[PDB]
mmCIF file of all heavy atoms in Angstrom:
data_model
loop_
_atom_site.group_PDB
_atom_site.id
_atom_site.type_symbol
_atom_site.label_atom_id
_atom_site.label_comp_id
_atom_site.label_asym_id
_atom_site.label_seq_id
_atom_site.Cartn_x
_atom_site.Cartn_y
_atom_site.Cartn_z
ATOM 1 N N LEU A 211 9.203 -12.151 5.450
ATOM 2 C CA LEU A 211 7.807 -12.247 5.771
ATOM 3 C C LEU A 211 7.220 -13.540 5.193
ATOM 4 O O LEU A 211 7.503 -13.914 4.095
ATOM 5 C CB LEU A 211 7.031 -11.065 5.247
ATOM 6 C CG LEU A 211 5.511 -11.047 5.578
ATOM 7 C CD1 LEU A 211 5.448 -10.844 7.113
ATOM 8 C CD2 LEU A 211 4.842 -9.931 4.982
ATOM 9 N N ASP A 212 6.382 -14.258 6.131
ATOM 10 C CA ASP A 212 5.819 -15.536 5.697
ATOM 11 C C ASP A 212 4.942 -15.397 4.443
ATOM 12 O O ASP A 212 4.221 -14.452 4.334
ATOM 13 C CB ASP A 212 5.024 -16.056 6.814
ATOM 14 C CG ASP A 212 4.156 -17.332 6.403
ATOM 15 O OD1 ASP A 212 4.841 -18.406 6.067
ATOM 16 O OD2 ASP A 212 2.954 -17.216 6.488
ATOM 17 N N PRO A 213 5.070 -16.227 3.495
ATOM 18 C CA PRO A 213 4.183 -16.039 2.179
ATOM 19 C C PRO A 213 2.711 -16.281 2.549
ATOM 20 O O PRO A 213 1.941 -15.612 1.722
ATOM 21 C CB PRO A 213 4.764 -17.120 1.265
ATOM 22 C CG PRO A 213 5.390 -18.062 2.178
ATOM 23 C CD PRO A 213 5.935 -17.434 3.415
ATOM 24 N N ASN A 214 2.316 -16.941 3.511
ATOM 25 C CA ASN A 214 0.999 -17.176 3.830
ATOM 26 C C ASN A 214 0.146 -15.964 4.280
ATOM 27 O O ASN A 214 -0.903 -15.662 3.912
ATOM 28 C CB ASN A 214 0.658 -18.381 4.644
ATOM 29 C CG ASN A 214 1.323 -19.662 4.027
ATOM 30 O OD1 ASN A 214 1.461 -19.867 2.876
ATOM 31 N ND2 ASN A 214 1.745 -20.460 5.019
ATOM 32 N N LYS A 215 0.813 -15.257 5.184
ATOM 33 C CA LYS A 215 0.236 -13.922 5.777
ATOM 34 C C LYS A 215 0.423 -12.798 4.888
ATOM 35 O O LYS A 215 0.103 -11.809 5.253
ATOM 36 C CB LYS A 215 0.886 -13.617 7.054
ATOM 37 C CG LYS A 215 2.431 -13.515 7.078
ATOM 38 C CD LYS A 215 3.046 -13.521 8.435
ATOM 39 C CE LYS A 215 2.276 -12.475 9.359
ATOM 40 N NZ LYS A 215 2.343 -11.014 8.702
ATOM 41 N N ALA A 216 0.696 -12.983 3.608
ATOM 42 C CA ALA A 216 0.698 -11.930 2.576
ATOM 43 C C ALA A 216 -0.292 -12.242 1.503
ATOM 44 O O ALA A 216 -1.176 -13.215 1.675
ATOM 45 C CB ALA A 216 2.127 -11.929 1.959
ATOM 46 N N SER A 217 -0.393 -11.523 0.424
ATOM 47 C CA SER A 217 -1.307 -11.723 -0.708
ATOM 48 C C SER A 217 -1.032 -13.151 -1.214
ATOM 49 O O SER A 217 0.052 -13.747 -1.337
ATOM 50 C CB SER A 217 -1.052 -10.707 -1.780
ATOM 51 O OG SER A 217 -2.021 -10.962 -2.819
ATOM 52 N N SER A 218 -2.235 -13.714 -1.498
ATOM 53 C CA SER A 218 -2.207 -15.199 -2.030
ATOM 54 C C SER A 218 -1.502 -15.329 -3.368
ATOM 55 O O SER A 218 -1.102 -16.330 -3.770
ATOM 56 C CB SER A 218 -3.665 -15.683 -2.104
ATOM 57 O OG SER A 218 -3.685 -17.058 -2.442
ATOM 58 N N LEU A 219 -1.505 -14.269 -4.083
ATOM 59 C CA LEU A 219 -0.984 -14.268 -5.547
ATOM 60 C C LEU A 219 0.515 -14.625 -5.488
ATOM 61 O O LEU A 219 0.969 -15.320 -6.363
ATOM 62 C CB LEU A 219 -1.266 -12.921 -6.234
ATOM 63 C CG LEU A 219 -2.758 -12.667 -6.628
ATOM 64 C CD1 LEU A 219 -2.700 -11.424 -7.440
ATOM 65 C CD2 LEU A 219 -3.283 -13.869 -7.412
ATOM 66 N N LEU A 220 1.257 -13.932 -4.522
ATOM 67 C CA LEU A 220 2.674 -14.022 -4.476
ATOM 68 C C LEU A 220 3.070 -15.522 -4.109
ATOM 69 O O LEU A 220 3.962 -16.151 -4.703
ATOM 70 C CB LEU A 220 3.304 -13.091 -3.464
ATOM 71 C CG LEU A 220 2.744 -11.583 -3.761
ATOM 72 C CD1 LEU A 220 3.438 -10.808 -2.527
ATOM 73 C CD2 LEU A 220 3.235 -11.229 -5.079
ATOM 74 N N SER A 221 2.461 -16.136 -3.166
ATOM 75 C CA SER A 221 2.831 -17.422 -2.610
ATOM 76 C C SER A 221 2.573 -18.588 -3.584
ATOM 77 O O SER A 221 3.685 -19.014 -4.107
ATOM 78 C CB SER A 221 2.010 -17.732 -1.310
ATOM 79 O OG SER A 221 2.135 -16.694 -0.362
ATOM 80 N N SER A 222 1.462 -18.667 -3.952
ATOM 81 C CA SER A 222 1.038 -19.800 -4.931
ATOM 82 C C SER A 222 1.209 -19.314 -6.372
ATOM 83 O O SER A 222 1.991 -19.764 -7.100
ATOM 84 C CB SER A 222 -0.303 -20.393 -4.725
ATOM 85 O OG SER A 222 -1.294 -19.461 -4.889
ATOM 86 N N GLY A 223 0.324 -18.309 -6.736
ATOM 87 C CA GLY A 223 0.312 -17.825 -8.108
ATOM 88 C C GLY A 223 -0.910 -16.958 -8.284
ATOM 89 O O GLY A 223 -1.649 -16.766 -7.512
ATOM 90 N N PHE A 224 -1.117 -16.858 -9.607
ATOM 91 C CA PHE A 224 -2.183 -16.133 -10.077
ATOM 92 C C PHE A 224 -2.886 -16.947 -11.286
ATOM 93 O O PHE A 224 -2.110 -17.453 -12.080
ATOM 94 C CB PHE A 224 -1.825 -14.773 -10.650
ATOM 95 C CG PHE A 224 -2.689 -14.111 -11.815
ATOM 96 C CD1 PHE A 224 -3.935 -13.647 -11.528
ATOM 97 C CD2 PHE A 224 -2.224 -14.167 -13.129
ATOM 98 C CE1 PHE A 224 -4.777 -13.187 -12.543
ATOM 99 C CE2 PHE A 224 -2.984 -13.736 -14.142
ATOM 100 C CZ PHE A 224 -4.274 -13.218 -13.739
ATOM 101 N N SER A 225 -4.217 -16.808 -11.406
ATOM 102 C CA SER A 225 -4.926 -17.627 -12.411
ATOM 103 C C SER A 225 -5.571 -16.610 -13.363
ATOM 104 O O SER A 225 -6.565 -15.861 -13.017
ATOM 105 C CB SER A 225 -5.997 -18.391 -11.693
ATOM 106 O OG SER A 225 -6.905 -17.694 -10.981
ATOM 107 N N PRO A 226 -5.226 -16.625 -14.555
ATOM 108 C CA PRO A 226 -5.901 -15.840 -15.610
ATOM 109 C C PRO A 226 -7.378 -16.210 -15.834
ATOM 110 O O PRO A 226 -7.559 -17.439 -15.761
ATOM 111 C CB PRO A 226 -5.097 -15.999 -16.934
ATOM 112 C CG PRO A 226 -3.752 -16.351 -16.338
ATOM 113 C CD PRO A 226 -4.020 -17.255 -15.193
ATOM 114 N N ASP A 227 -8.097 -15.278 -16.170
ATOM 115 C CA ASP A 227 -9.658 -15.501 -16.617
ATOM 116 C C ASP A 227 -9.859 -14.703 -17.722
ATOM 117 O O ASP A 227 -11.084 -14.369 -18.002
ATOM 118 C CB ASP A 227 -10.456 -15.446 -15.427
ATOM 119 C CG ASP A 227 -11.810 -16.259 -15.652
ATOM 120 O OD1 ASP A 227 -12.174 -16.747 -16.768
ATOM 121 O OD2 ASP A 227 -12.468 -16.425 -14.639
ATOM 122 N N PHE A 228 -8.877 -14.140 -18.529
ATOM 123 C CA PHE A 228 -9.213 -13.149 -19.588
ATOM 124 C C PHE A 228 -9.778 -13.956 -20.809
ATOM 125 O O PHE A 228 -9.686 -15.253 -20.973
ATOM 126 C CB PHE A 228 -7.807 -12.479 -19.932
ATOM 127 C CG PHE A 228 -6.957 -11.962 -18.743
ATOM 128 C CD1 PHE A 228 -5.662 -12.067 -18.745
ATOM 129 C CD2 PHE A 228 -7.622 -11.423 -17.695
ATOM 130 C CE1 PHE A 228 -4.978 -11.790 -17.638
ATOM 131 C CE2 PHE A 228 -6.933 -11.047 -16.624
ATOM 132 C CZ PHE A 228 -5.551 -11.139 -16.610
ATOM 133 N N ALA A 229 -10.411 -13.024 -21.621
ATOM 134 C CA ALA A 229 -11.113 -13.609 -22.704
ATOM 135 C C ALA A 229 -10.871 -12.737 -23.921
ATOM 136 O O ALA A 229 -10.415 -11.514 -23.783
ATOM 137 C CB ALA A 229 -12.581 -13.631 -22.526
ATOM 138 N N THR A 230 -10.753 -13.224 -25.196
ATOM 139 C CA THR A 230 -10.738 -12.594 -26.382
ATOM 140 C C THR A 230 -11.488 -13.312 -27.552
ATOM 141 O O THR A 230 -11.759 -14.506 -27.384
ATOM 142 C CB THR A 230 -9.169 -12.510 -26.841
ATOM 143 O OG1 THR A 230 -9.102 -11.596 -27.838
ATOM 144 C CG2 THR A 230 -8.681 -13.864 -27.146
ATOM 145 N N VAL A 231 -11.797 -12.651 -28.579
ATOM 146 C CA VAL A 231 -12.379 -13.100 -29.717
ATOM 147 C C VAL A 231 -11.612 -12.598 -30.968
ATOM 148 O O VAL A 231 -11.321 -11.424 -31.090
ATOM 149 C CB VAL A 231 -13.938 -12.724 -29.847
ATOM 150 C CG1 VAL A 231 -14.120 -11.238 -29.782
ATOM 151 C CG2 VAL A 231 -14.549 -13.334 -31.083
ATOM 152 N N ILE A 232 -11.300 -13.445 -31.847
ATOM 153 C CA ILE A 232 -10.745 -13.110 -33.208
ATOM 154 C C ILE A 232 -11.773 -13.400 -34.280
ATOM 155 O O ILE A 232 -12.411 -14.398 -34.304
ATOM 156 C CB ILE A 232 -9.411 -13.953 -33.408
ATOM 157 C CG1 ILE A 232 -9.666 -15.432 -33.264
ATOM 158 C CG2 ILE A 232 -8.274 -13.431 -32.400
ATOM 159 C CD1 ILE A 232 -8.446 -16.221 -33.605
ATOM 160 N N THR A 233 -11.862 -12.430 -35.214
ATOM 161 C CA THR A 233 -12.853 -12.571 -36.248
ATOM 162 C C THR A 233 -12.073 -12.797 -37.588
ATOM 163 O O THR A 233 -11.131 -12.037 -37.858
ATOM 164 C CB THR A 233 -13.757 -11.245 -36.329
ATOM 165 O OG1 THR A 233 -12.948 -10.154 -36.121
ATOM 166 C CG2 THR A 233 -14.944 -11.319 -35.228
ATOM 167 N N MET A 234 -12.762 -13.534 -38.526
ATOM 168 C CA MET A 234 -12.020 -14.022 -39.688
ATOM 169 C C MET A 234 -12.969 -13.861 -40.802
ATOM 170 O O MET A 234 -14.270 -14.162 -40.677
ATOM 171 C CB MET A 234 -11.541 -15.368 -39.610
ATOM 172 C CG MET A 234 -10.593 -15.787 -40.670
ATOM 173 S SD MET A 234 -9.830 -17.454 -40.451
ATOM 174 C CE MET A 234 -8.693 -17.449 -41.695
ATOM 175 N N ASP A 235 -12.529 -13.475 -42.001
ATOM 176 C CA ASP A 235 -13.386 -13.426 -43.163
ATOM 177 C C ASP A 235 -14.048 -14.798 -43.495
ATOM 178 O O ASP A 235 -13.268 -15.801 -43.475
ATOM 179 C CB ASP A 235 -12.620 -12.930 -44.298
ATOM 180 C CG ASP A 235 -13.396 -13.059 -45.617
ATOM 181 O OD1 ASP A 235 -14.475 -12.567 -45.798
ATOM 182 O OD2 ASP A 235 -12.696 -13.661 -46.556
ATOM 183 N N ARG A 236 -15.218 -14.767 -43.694
ATOM 184 C CA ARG A 236 -16.085 -15.954 -44.110
ATOM 185 C C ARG A 236 -15.661 -16.553 -45.421
ATOM 186 O O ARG A 236 -15.813 -17.868 -45.626
ATOM 187 C CB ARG A 236 -17.514 -15.912 -43.991
ATOM 188 C CG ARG A 236 -18.328 -17.126 -44.079
ATOM 189 C CD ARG A 236 -19.789 -16.949 -43.720
ATOM 190 N NE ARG A 236 -19.934 -16.653 -42.351
ATOM 191 C CZ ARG A 236 -21.066 -16.717 -41.672
ATOM 192 N NH1 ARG A 236 -22.245 -16.881 -42.275
ATOM 193 N NH2 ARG A 236 -21.047 -16.376 -40.231
ATOM 194 N N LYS A 237 -15.116 -15.710 -46.281
ATOM 195 C CA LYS A 237 -14.897 -16.191 -47.667
ATOM 196 C C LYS A 237 -13.263 -16.350 -47.902
ATOM 197 O O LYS A 237 -12.765 -16.244 -49.000
ATOM 198 C CB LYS A 237 -15.377 -15.170 -48.664
ATOM 199 C CG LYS A 237 -16.869 -15.207 -48.885
ATOM 200 C CD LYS A 237 -17.414 -13.772 -49.049
ATOM 201 C CE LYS A 237 -17.916 -13.163 -47.725
ATOM 202 N NZ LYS A 237 -16.703 -13.028 -46.712
ATOM 203 N N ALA A 238 -12.460 -16.525 -46.775
ATOM 204 C CA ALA A 238 -11.024 -16.633 -46.845
ATOM 205 C C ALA A 238 -10.711 -17.980 -47.488
ATOM 206 O O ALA A 238 -11.443 -19.042 -47.157
ATOM 207 C CB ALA A 238 -10.434 -16.565 -45.419
ATOM 208 N N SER A 239 -9.789 -18.101 -48.295
ATOM 209 C CA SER A 239 -9.294 -19.241 -49.046
ATOM 210 C C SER A 239 -8.699 -20.243 -48.029
ATOM 211 O O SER A 239 -9.167 -21.480 -48.060
ATOM 212 C CB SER A 239 -8.271 -18.894 -50.173
ATOM 213 O OG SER A 239 -7.173 -18.303 -49.519
ATOM 214 N N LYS A 240 -7.850 -19.758 -47.158
ATOM 215 C CA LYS A 240 -7.222 -20.608 -46.136
ATOM 216 C C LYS A 240 -7.855 -20.374 -44.798
ATOM 217 O O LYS A 240 -7.783 -19.333 -44.249
ATOM 218 C CB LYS A 240 -5.786 -20.357 -45.974
ATOM 219 C CG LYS A 240 -4.917 -20.741 -47.365
ATOM 220 C CD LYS A 240 -3.523 -20.517 -47.212
ATOM 221 C CE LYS A 240 -2.700 -20.984 -48.462
ATOM 222 N NZ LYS A 240 -1.206 -20.589 -48.330
ATOM 223 N N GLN A 241 -8.600 -21.291 -44.319
ATOM 224 C CA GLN A 241 -9.207 -21.199 -43.006
ATOM 225 C C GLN A 241 -8.350 -21.800 -41.986
ATOM 226 O O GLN A 241 -8.717 -22.604 -41.194
ATOM 227 C CB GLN A 241 -10.722 -22.018 -42.994
ATOM 228 C CG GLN A 241 -11.611 -21.606 -44.160
ATOM 229 C CD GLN A 241 -12.033 -20.104 -44.072
ATOM 230 O OE1 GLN A 241 -11.911 -19.625 -42.951
ATOM 231 N NE2 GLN A 241 -12.484 -19.633 -45.103
ATOM 232 N N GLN A 242 -7.223 -21.124 -41.789
ATOM 233 C CA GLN A 242 -6.320 -21.549 -40.704
ATOM 234 C C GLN A 242 -5.390 -20.268 -40.416
ATOM 235 O O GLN A 242 -4.938 -19.633 -41.259
ATOM 236 C CB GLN A 242 -5.477 -22.614 -41.090
ATOM 237 C CG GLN A 242 -4.459 -23.214 -40.043
ATOM 238 C CD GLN A 242 -3.124 -22.529 -40.282
ATOM 239 O OE1 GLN A 242 -2.709 -22.261 -41.428
ATOM 240 N NE2 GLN A 242 -2.472 -22.194 -39.177
ATOM 241 N N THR A 243 -5.070 -20.092 -38.944
ATOM 242 C CA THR A 243 -4.299 -19.102 -38.591
ATOM 243 C C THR A 243 -3.321 -19.666 -37.555
ATOM 244 O O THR A 243 -3.196 -20.861 -37.228
ATOM 245 C CB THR A 243 -4.923 -17.908 -38.102
ATOM 246 O OG1 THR A 243 -5.890 -18.284 -37.153
ATOM 247 C CG2 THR A 243 -5.662 -17.133 -39.295
ATOM 248 N N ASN A 244 -2.533 -18.737 -36.842
ATOM 249 C CA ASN A 244 -1.613 -19.191 -35.759
ATOM 250 C C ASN A 244 -1.729 -18.433 -34.469
ATOM 251 O O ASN A 244 -1.691 -17.225 -34.518
ATOM 252 C CB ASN A 244 -0.177 -19.048 -36.294
ATOM 253 C CG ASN A 244 0.077 -19.913 -37.499
ATOM 254 O OD1 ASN A 244 -0.307 -19.420 -38.682
ATOM 255 N ND2 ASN A 244 0.659 -21.027 -37.261
#
């Protein structure tokens, strides 16, 4: 089946738009994470 006449996600791809927040202690000695 032709990729264009199917869902657009399969042919080219998918684009995330997800979001997240990480909260950190304000009095932390080391202000760095990974």
Side-chain angles (χ1 to χ4, degrees):
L211 185 63
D212 170 70
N214 301 334
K215 61 190 304 299
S217 182
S218 180
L219 290 188
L220 310 176
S221 308
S222 67
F224 150 81
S225 60
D227 204 343
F228 311 140
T230 189
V231 54
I232 53 177
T233 44
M234 193 177 188
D235 167 56
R236 186 167 291 191
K237 292 142 265 59
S239 61
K240 293 179 179 179
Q241 303 297 341
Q242 179 272 324
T243 54
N244 300 80

